[PDB]
Design a binder for this molecule. Structure first.
Ligand SMILES: [Mg+2]
Ligand SMILES: [Mg+2]
Ligand SMILES: [Mg+2]
Ligand SMILES: [Mg+2]
Ligand SMILES: [Mg+2]
Ligand SMILES: [Mg+2]
Ligand SMILES: [Mg+2]
Ligand SMILES: [Mg+2]
Ligand SMILES: [Mg+2]
Ligand SMILES: [Mg+2]
Ligand SMILES: [Mg+2]
Ligand SMILES: [Mg+2]
Ligand SMILES: [Mg+2]
Ligand SMILES: [Mg+2]
Ligand SMILES: [Mg+2]
Ligand SMILES: [Mg+2]
Ligand SMILES: [Mg+2]
Lengths: 179, 24, 71, 69, 118, 87
RNA sequence: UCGCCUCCUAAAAGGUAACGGAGGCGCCCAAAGGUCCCCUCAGGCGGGACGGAAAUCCGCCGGAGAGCGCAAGGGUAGAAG
RNA sequence: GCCCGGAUAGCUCAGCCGGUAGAGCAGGGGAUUGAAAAUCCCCGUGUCCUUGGUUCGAUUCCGAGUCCGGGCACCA
RNA sequence: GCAUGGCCCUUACGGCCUGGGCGACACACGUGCUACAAUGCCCACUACAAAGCGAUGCCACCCGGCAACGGGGAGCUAAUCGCAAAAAGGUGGGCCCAGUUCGGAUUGGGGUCUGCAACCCGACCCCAUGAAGCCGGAAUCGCUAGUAAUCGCGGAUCAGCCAUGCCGC
């Protein structure tokens, strides 16, 4: 039992094969990774860490994130050779669907706002990369544990190539778009 | 409370009536 | 895998003020919900929360359209 | 003598340490005219920021001190 | 007695306690109590599981309280900053919006004791 | 906040509506900064008088329960400068 | 100015002077040491919530221009990082 | 090396036998005067030298360390 | 305000209109209002004034609405009708010393009413917010009796109202 799962195997999968498709059961556009970096709102860590973004955001996607740390010298940013300033989380397979699907069509919404996802945003290999104004506002809220408006930036790497093959995969999977 | 609209005094003062100072 | 730390992983309920939705699989039971109440894809959405209360009914298509301005 | 490029300047004269009297600071625009034009006084006074009385006084100082270049 | 959020009055009358919620004034508060058969004058330190949830149900379902509401305002506020809304440029500048006077006063929306005498 | 009426100048309204018959140029300046932002008119470019000049307002549509004046600040101000007392 | 280190002058071994040219040292590290196991950079171009023109991300392209406590040189990712 | 003392706002200095950091200069507001000086009031400015300790709590107490100052040692 | 000698402008320094402005805001000061609370506050009930004002005006009494108001609608040319009811007081209950059931600023939202029209810029009502203030430095003001202090009521202006002002009771 999985939610979207079917949506891709049952739907999208075929509409593509013949709209494109042909021959191999592999050269078909499909996702493989879903990473997401926070960065730490409009003010980074500080010796007194934050890690709430960790513990909280961790389970807003189901599974703790890692901790990245800067590099090189900063000067006018306040940082140094780094440590920390990161805290991101990748993850594929199951959790990839569950996180974006059980949140794609039910979560993303609610946040008081406009049209669809920024069109011209893909590149090659079709990966896109949106990036809400962070705003940790919904889904999985269960208030309290409210210190900063930290949210994130989502990265979605798919197989495919060009933008159509990629876009077709998302567009026909449940990704409202263009303004 | 003379400046508190939501009260007896508040209303009397302002010279008005309402949910908090009914016209008898 | 990774023992410890990881959440709990358990199904619950995705309520919904407009019919059921996604099948439990996260870590939250209750929630405002609202899948979309109007999708949004292209149309079927843009419910533009501007509806001037009781539009029409007054000031409508009258006053005398263009008229015989042609003369 | 005459100037070549039009200039804009301010004339100051603040007298108030002991407080006997006061002062009368002012600003003006000075630019060159075709040869043979002579002198001219532009009376560009707005809402009366200056008394219609001290004007000729501020002119009898320009014109006057205009003797020696 | 965690109600709308994490605000558990107690030691204080239920009618006065509720107030401590961000959406519950003596008004609404006093209503919910008579729409749940709860005796107002009863301290929270006596509320029964029954009444507690029996009440928690109403309050927490009807209107949108603490946090939930909070966000609303913020939204409405920013929406006034669109194409050039005056009541909006008012929030931006950080001055009164309800037509008040600024030559003097207006301190509630300004910094107490600014000075700056040339 | 008026009553059961909704207000709009009859002639600021016309120029608009008869224009919706065909649709075109946004060259539509009105001094009626007093009229309610034309709901049944979300998209033209209205030139609301500023008391000094006509400030074009794109008038999107998220702004319909307002007035054409709310989008034409009438006063000009950009911080103060120096004080001076002793008088 | 006076001892020590790097480069040049030094004429393709080594060495080589002048009050010749140009910079450093008088420390430091218990992890910046030993070993075992993993990992690979800088930038360029995309796409990116706050994001400078380098915070951290994602995708290609990139044999080393990054890194190696501090001068300079030599060395170095088939690692010394 | 030994004893003794000192380091507190940009400068000049109080800090009382533990809790809080202050006068002064300068400047900015006020107040007083019919007015201008003079005078009064109110502001903003601290790693309290650094380290470890003691205490619920340290600028204060204790131990060391650096840099000043005073006296006496002495320096392969 | 008006009047008035002289000076000055007369396709404008006169006149009309729409819109703005006199309501601006880093700041300073004057007069005030509301307070910081228990000799207080809140709610229900129950008393005792004076001086004034009212016909395209004051508007009883009903009814819808929680309200503001809205429909209906009597009387009243008003010592004959009503704007009223005065408030502080009194009685019963509630609060229990906390930035509070003190205080109400500010802000969001939903409405009402006047007027062609309430963006700048009205007044009310209702829900939700609920700020500074728990007594005030140098200084400084008022009052010698039904005065001060405190409580409310009326009127002129006025469609409405920014009146916390003013003249009065
Ligand atoms: Mg109150
Ligand atoms: Mg050689
Ligand atoms: Mg040789
Ligand atoms: Mg090791
Ligand atoms: Mg005006
Ligand atoms: Mg005025
Ligand atoms: Mg104003
Ligand atoms: Mg008073
Ligand atoms: Mg009723
Ligand atoms: Mg009692
Ligand atoms: Mg207005
Ligand atoms: Mg409050
Ligand atoms: Mg306070
Ligand atoms: Mg107190
Ligand atoms: Mg006397
Ligand atoms: Mg009136
Ligand atoms: Mg006002």
């Amino acid at each position: 039992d999985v939610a979207l799962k079917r949506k891709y195997y049952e739907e999208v999968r075929p509409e593509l094969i013949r709209r494109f498709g042909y021959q191999n059961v592999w050269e078909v556009p499909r996702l493989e990774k879903v990473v997401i970096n926070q960065g730490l709102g409009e003010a980074k860590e500080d010796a007194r860490i934050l890690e709430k973004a960790a513990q909280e955001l961790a389970l807003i996607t189901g599974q703790k994130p890692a901790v990245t740390r800067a590099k090189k010298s900063i000067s006018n940013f306040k940082l140094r050779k780094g440590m920390p300033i990161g805290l991101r989380v990748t993850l594929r397979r199951d959790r990839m669907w569950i996180f974006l699907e059980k949140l794609l069509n039910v979560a993303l919404p609610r946040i008081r706002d406009f049209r669809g996802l920024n069109p011209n945003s893909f590149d090659g290999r079709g990966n896109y990369n949106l990036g809400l104004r962070e705003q940790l506002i919904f889904p999985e809220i269960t208030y309290d544990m409210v210190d900063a408006l930290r949210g994130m930036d989502i990265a979605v790497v798919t197989t495919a190539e060009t933008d159509e093959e990629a876009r077709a995969l998302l567009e026909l999977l449940g990704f409202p778009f263009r303004k | 409370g003379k400046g508190d609209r939501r009260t007896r005094r508040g209303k009397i003062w302002r010279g008005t009536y309402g949910k908090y100072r009914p016209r008898k | 895998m990774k023992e410890g730390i990881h959440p709990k992983l358990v199904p619950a309920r995705i309520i919904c003020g407009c019919g059921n939705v996604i099948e439990t699989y996260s870590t939250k039971p209750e929630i405002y919900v609202e899948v979309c109440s109007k999708c949004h894809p292209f149309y079927t959405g843009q419910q533009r929360f501007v509806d001037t209360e009781g539009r029409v009914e007054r000031f409508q298509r009258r006053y005398g359209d263009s008229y015989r301005k042609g003369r | 003598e005459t100037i070549t490029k039009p200039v804009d300047v301010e004339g100051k004269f603040i007298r108030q340490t002991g407080g006997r009297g006061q002062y009368g600071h002012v600003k003006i625009k000075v630019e060159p005219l075709p040869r043979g034009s002579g002198f001219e006084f532009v009376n560009a006074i707005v809402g009366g920021v200056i008394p219609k009385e001290y004007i000729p006084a501020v002119q009898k100082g320009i014109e006057e001190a205009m003797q020696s270049g | 007695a965690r109600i709308a959020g994490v605000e558990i009055p107690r030691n204080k009358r239920v009618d006065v306690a509720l107030t401590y919620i961000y959406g519950i004034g003596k008004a609404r508060a006093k209503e919910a109590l008579e729409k749940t058969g709860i005796n107002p004058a009863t301290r929270v330190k006596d509320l029964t599981e029954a009444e507690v949830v029996r009440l928690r149900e109403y309050v927490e379902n009807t209107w949108k309280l603490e946090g939930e509401l909070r966000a609303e305002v913020a939204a409405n506020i920013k929406r006034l900053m669109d194409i050039g809304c005056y009541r909006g440029l008012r929030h931006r500048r950080g001055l009164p919006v309800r037509g008040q006077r600024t030559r003097t006063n207006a301190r509630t929306r300004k910094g107490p004791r600014k000075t700056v005498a040339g | 906040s008026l009553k059961k009426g909704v207000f709009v100048d009859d002639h600021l309204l016309e120029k608009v509506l008869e224009l919706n018959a065909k649709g075109e140029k946004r060259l539509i300046k009105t001094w009626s900064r007093r009229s309610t932002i034309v709901p049944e008119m979300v998209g033209h470019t209205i030139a609301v008088y500023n008391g000094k000049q006509h400030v074009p307002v794109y008038i999107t549509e998220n702004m319909v329960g307002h007035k054409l004046g709310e989008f034409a600040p009438t006063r000009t101000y950009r911080g103060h400068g120096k004080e001076a007392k002793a008088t």
